[PDB]
């Protein structure tokens, strides 16, 4: 029995490759028509998956950037339990497997890293284990601060409680209106048969919090470019968050974007804001690269 | 600001009534054209509403009977913090006033109740509070029985834990699959919006758990006529329940009629499986009826 | 079988009273040699019991006050599980019954209350049941607030986790030299086989924490003269509630009187502590009896 | 300011040795008068001390033994928070130093090892950390099983759960009446002012759990010689744990003598039982010694 995704296609009729753990991982790519110069990785948000990219990805290959994927563990078309893992530092090392794959391929070329929500943060986690590997890192509404509201000391102390005795123990819910204030994008979400809407897991979100106290490890060490691309009115990520980012990582090359009253899915929000964010994009990486 | 359902629409437009705790329950009714000759109230489970029985509503209608429902507070059009009730009883005490309030227009008619799921808890609870009183009781997969495997006495433990901690709490996920084994359904379940699919919240488990141990205890003292309708591979009402319901109960008119392989939603199971089952209430109804 | 107390000497040999529970409470008194000018009841701490009242009952009985008392159920010679009852109020019940007893014999006497710790608490709550019918209450470092330091919001949650998951369960262990700077009286306390050194019970720690909500909704109504003794050092009962005592209470007759760096047993402490409050016991309540 | 006992007495005023963790634990030595035939290391049980095994070493001594011991850290006149430990090994690890260094004094000497409660799991954990270093083992009702009534799978999980919140939290109370039959040793045992009886606390009751899982796992190894000394009213350390012992370690070289009826502290019960205990430790002991 050849092995398919979790929704029953062939992986040898997909791209993919396989982690350290032996897991399927379900890849994409969008290669440039000539020669590209640079390589970049999209690094997905939770739940989530790397077709939902498809149109930012469109934009970086027009600027003839390779740009590269694959569905985290437990995650779209890859393989594992739906949002779960042994640990956070695995999304971190499959991340390198495949870009030092990519690598292998492509010598010589820049490596971006472009991340949103908990895929920021493994982006953060990946450049960090990396100093002065990459060439820029582009951060979506990135997850480096614990929610002030849904995880305070006390929450965290009884999710830790939980994952002792109720570790399979799966949580909820979400409000899908918090992603974005454009209605479409909100319904193409709860539409999306990739997506995994069943609420946080218990040991899982062990792991997310596991994932902001090693980003803030991190921060005093990070040298790494970026852009930081964020929400005033972010409920999942809050915007306290990327001034910390802004203040406490040591980039030489930091930058800030914040869009006022806009939610969180930045590249899936209202069009004046997506239309900005997709521009800010390309012109951040277009300096950096040649 | 007159008062507006969940979902915006003015109390004042549609059929509904205010319960003791001064909210408003959507309410809903399939008069026959001429005189009924009885009344008939539907009892819908968890996270459900009153819309999801318009057909079995309107067979019922087509037997000479007043159909009568409302949406239970928390739920559908109603009023009230989604999935939630300070205690289980409110329940059981709204449907005595909606019942009490269709015996005054139309006295000296019998009274029947189907309820289904919790449905059937609340059911079963309403009549043996009122001895006597209602002419017969329509359950389809009633809760009665904890899940052997969603709750056992450990997790009942740890739930009445969170209970104290994190009440607002909520749970997860279901996998909506369970229900039926009918797709076009499935689908059709995932597509209402006056539905709730957030996950079971912590203090309204326990009032489920309450339910049951109210249930448990009622049944030596159930006397009013039953059709139990359920199905051998139902994965939240299990079947054990229904044989126990079939022995504990004091009733002298019991039937019990098993579906072999059907799921939860026997009324919106396979279309052999459904057929039987409106056919079935209506052979019943009817013989009980004049 | 005769009942006996825990010791194994039968009731029928000792003075007692049999409580509203049907269980017997050991007695003690002391009778002046004349016609009594008054009635005062001790009501002792936790763990300990009557027996360590001697000397003060003594010094009131040369007063010409009929002093009497018994321990409370759980504790010294009575019967009841060690330092537990199903709730706090079986206390003052008791207190009641034995007050009521005990004027029954003595009509048109005045009667006060003399309480030590929970004791205090239970005098407290004891005349808040009974407004204006007792002449004085004599406080020794009574309980009526919660540690801030062994009971702070979160431990009270903690515990209140506990009762349900593990109610019997004991807890411990309390240094011994918290009580009193007087040495000899330390090493008294230890050797007492009447008094109960076993760490407080989880089901039981809630009850004293009933204890304090209680009492703080009571002293708004509380109205009874008071004397109330307290030492800045006191570790068990923070010197803050003494203030918080002479603050939150109507009462028109209200005296605090601290004792500066000395412990919990104000009456077991320093010589030279123990004899002012000796003293000032003896000026306080003679002033108030006639 | 130099170092002294947690009874104020300066360490170097007494026997002691320096811990890995620098710590000093107090030592105690029985030398015979001439030539030793062998060494033996003296292991106590939890809350008690080294002295405790005063006369029980004198009978070594005059066996030609040079006995050795040491308290346990948290233990007796040794440095460190009383009843706590980082991790259960430290007390193995700090055994093994003391043994290293009476070895290095006299070498070639065969050593044994004397074991009680907590310190037998000590005793079988070193011997199995050093297999065929050992001459023999004397095990006096040793730490191997779990109390089926004082640590169920379900205590067990909550101790645990109280390890992450309740951590510094203090236990209780054991009945000091279970230790001995023999009343006389039982009010030594509470007059032993080195001795702990504050109720065991959370964070080491996890240790003492460690042990257990570890004496399990090294049993399959356990080569050394051993005798076995069991009462069958051991409430403590049950019986059963004796005879899974008998059967699971691998050693060519054991025995097992049950003493009927008698409790916890076999080398400190009835007269009868102490009697024999130290005859048969004297009798296998001398066997097994040139
Ligand atoms: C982006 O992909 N995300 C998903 C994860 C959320 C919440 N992360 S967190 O605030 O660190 C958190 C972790 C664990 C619990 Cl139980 C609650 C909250 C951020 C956005
Ligand atoms: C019908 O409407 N339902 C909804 C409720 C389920 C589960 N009820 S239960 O098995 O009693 C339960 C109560 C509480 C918890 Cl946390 C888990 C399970 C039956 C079908
Ligand atoms: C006087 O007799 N006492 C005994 C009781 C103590 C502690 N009472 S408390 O601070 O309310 C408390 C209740 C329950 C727990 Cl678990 C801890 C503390 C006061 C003096
Ligand atoms: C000998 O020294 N002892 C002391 C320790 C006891 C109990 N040990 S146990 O049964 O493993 C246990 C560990 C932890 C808890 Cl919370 C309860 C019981 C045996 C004799």
């Not at 934009?59 to 779960?84: C, I, K, P, T, Y």
């Not at 010589?108 to 990459?134: D, N, Y």
């Not at 946080?200 to 979100?205: A, E, I, M, R, S």
Request: aromatic content about 8%.
């Amino acid at each position: 029995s050849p092995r398919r995704t979790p929704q029953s296609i062939p992986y040898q009729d997909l791209p993919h490759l396989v982690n350290a753990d032996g897991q399927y991982l379900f890849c994409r790519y969008w290669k440039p028509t000539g020669t590209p110069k640079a390589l970049i990785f999209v690094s997905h948000g939770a739940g989530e998956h790397s077709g939902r990219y498809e149109e930012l990805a469109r934009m970086l290959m027009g600027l003839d950037l390779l740009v590269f994927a694959h569905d985290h563990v437990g995650h779209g078309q890859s393989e594992g339990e739906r949002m779960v893992v042994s640990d956070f530092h695995v999304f971190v090392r499959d991340v390198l497997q495949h870009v030092d794959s990519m690598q292998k391929d492509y010598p010589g070329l820049p490596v971006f890293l472009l991340g949103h929500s908990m895929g920021g943060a493994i982006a953060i986690l990946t450049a960090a284990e990396r100093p002065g590997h990459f060439a820029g890192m582009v951060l979506i509404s990135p997850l480096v601060l614990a929610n002030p509201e849904s995880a305070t000391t006390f929450k965290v102390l009884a999710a830790k409680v939980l994952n002792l005795v109720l570790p399979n123990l799966s949580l909820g819910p979400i409000d899908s209106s918090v992603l974005s204030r454009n209605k479409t994008e909100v319904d193409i979400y709860n539409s999306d048969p990739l997506i995994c809407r069943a609420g946080l897991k218990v040991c899982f979100g062990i792991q997310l919090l596991n994932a902001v106290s090693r980003v803030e490890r991190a921060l005093p060490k990070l040298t790494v470019p970026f852009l930081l691309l964020q929400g005033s009115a972010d409920r999942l990520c809050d915007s306290k968050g990327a001034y910390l980012l802004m203040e406490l990582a040591k980039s030489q090359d930091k930058t800030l974007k914040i869009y006022e009253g806009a939610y969180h899915v930045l590249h899936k929000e209202l069009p004046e804001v997506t239309n900005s964010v997709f521009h800010e994009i390309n012109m951040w990486v277009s300096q950096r690269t040649a």
